[PDB]
Amino acid sequence: LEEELKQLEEELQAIEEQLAQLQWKAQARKEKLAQLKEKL
Amino acid sequence: LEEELKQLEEELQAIEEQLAQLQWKAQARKEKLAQLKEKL
Amino acid sequence: QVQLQESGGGLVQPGGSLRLSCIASGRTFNPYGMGWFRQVPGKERTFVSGITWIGGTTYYVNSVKGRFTISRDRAKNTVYLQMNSLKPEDTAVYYCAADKDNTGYNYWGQGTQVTVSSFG
Amino acid sequence: QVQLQESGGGLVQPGGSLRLSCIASGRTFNPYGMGWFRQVPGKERTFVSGITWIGGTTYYVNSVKGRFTISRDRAKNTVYLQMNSLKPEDTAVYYCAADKDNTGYNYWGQGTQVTVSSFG
């Protein structure tokens, strides 16, 4: 129903916020690894 | 160097494991929302 | 109110294979998904693979891509992990998990030991 | 050993805009990335946007996509959040953050209040 869809959407969006945070952290480290690779 | 690259790779992979876990959780809820949408 | 029971662990040589199973029983159970985690002594449980319950969509961590395959059967409330090309670094206790609500905690089983040891 | 100081908050009508800034100072500082989080009373801080320090790659949560833009300047160790098309539901304390190591904790500033209130 209406409330089930609305509430589950809110819970999905909270997980998605954490997901984006981890994507940011992961990409930042990938870029660091690439930079260190160039120093070799 | 060698050890910096190896250790940072390990730390990246730990974040990537958590990222995949959140992707799994997010997609599972998206599928539930789609199913509830069909009941309406 | 739901119990999770694993099976399928053991001891293999590098290159071997194992099939893990996990059955959920108890009160009627319809999770968002089920998955597998692993743990070595002194460390936290880490994600290995997951499958969404409705769609059957699969997720794998980079260290097992192309070697492990997850599947599930809704009729029996059972999730499976086919583990091929096993390496010593895969040695861990493997735990089954159910994503059942939005508390942030999954429901877990009791773990099955997986040992990959090069004997010669 | 690094301090983070925000600026740019305030009170706008729905549809308005604000530009947040954050400067890092202290011991020499080269983070993995910087980002912005937000918090409403009684809830935990939630991610809003992040930028990687080397590449400048940006990430946004779904509720601000197409409305907010993040940027950074390495010369001044400063990160910015341009917040357009503001809605009442964006009302929160906005916090600046630095991803500096692998402890799982970021370094934070002291927050800047953002209020979006429909007055008439």
Author numbering:
A (entry chain B), B (entry chain B): 1 to 40
C (entry chain A), D (entry chain A): 1 to 120
Please quote the paper that reports this structure.
Since APH CC (APH2) is antiparallel, it presents an identical binding surface on both chains, resulting in a 2:2 (nanobody:CC peptide) stoichiometry of all nanobody-APH complexes. The crystal structure of the Nb492-APH2 complex shows a completely different binding mode in which the β-plane of the nanobody is aligned parallel to the APH2 axis. In the Nb492-APH2 complex, the hotspot interactions are mediated by the APH residue R29d, which is involved in a salt bridge with the residues from the CDR3 loop and a cation-pi interaction with the Tyr from the CDR1 loop. In contrast to the epitope of Nb26 which extends over both APH chains, each of the Nb49 interacts almost exclusively with a single APH chain. ITC titrations showed that the affinity of Nb492-APH2 is Kd = 570 nM and therefore weaker than that of Nb26. Interestingly, also in the case of Nb49, higher affinity is observed for TET12SN (Kd = 160 nM) than for the APH peptide. Nb49, for example, made the tetrahedral cage more compact, with Rg being lower than that observed for the free TET12SN (Rg = 3.4 nm).
Here, we present and characterize a panel of nanobodies that can be used to functionalize designed proteins built using CC dimers such as protein origami. The nanobodies were selected to bind to different CC modules representing the edges of the designed tetrahedral protein. The crystal structures of five complexes consisting of CC dimers and nanobodies show that the nanobodies bind primarily to the noninteracting sites of the CC dimers and, in addition to complementarity determining region 3 (CDR) loops, strongly rely on the nanobody framework residues for binding. The most extensively characterized protein origami cage, tetrahedron TET12SN, self-assembles from a single 461 amino acid residue polypeptide chain consisting of 12 CC dimer-forming modules adopting antiparallel or parallel orientations (APH2, BCR2, GCN2, P3-P4, P5-P6, and P7-P8).
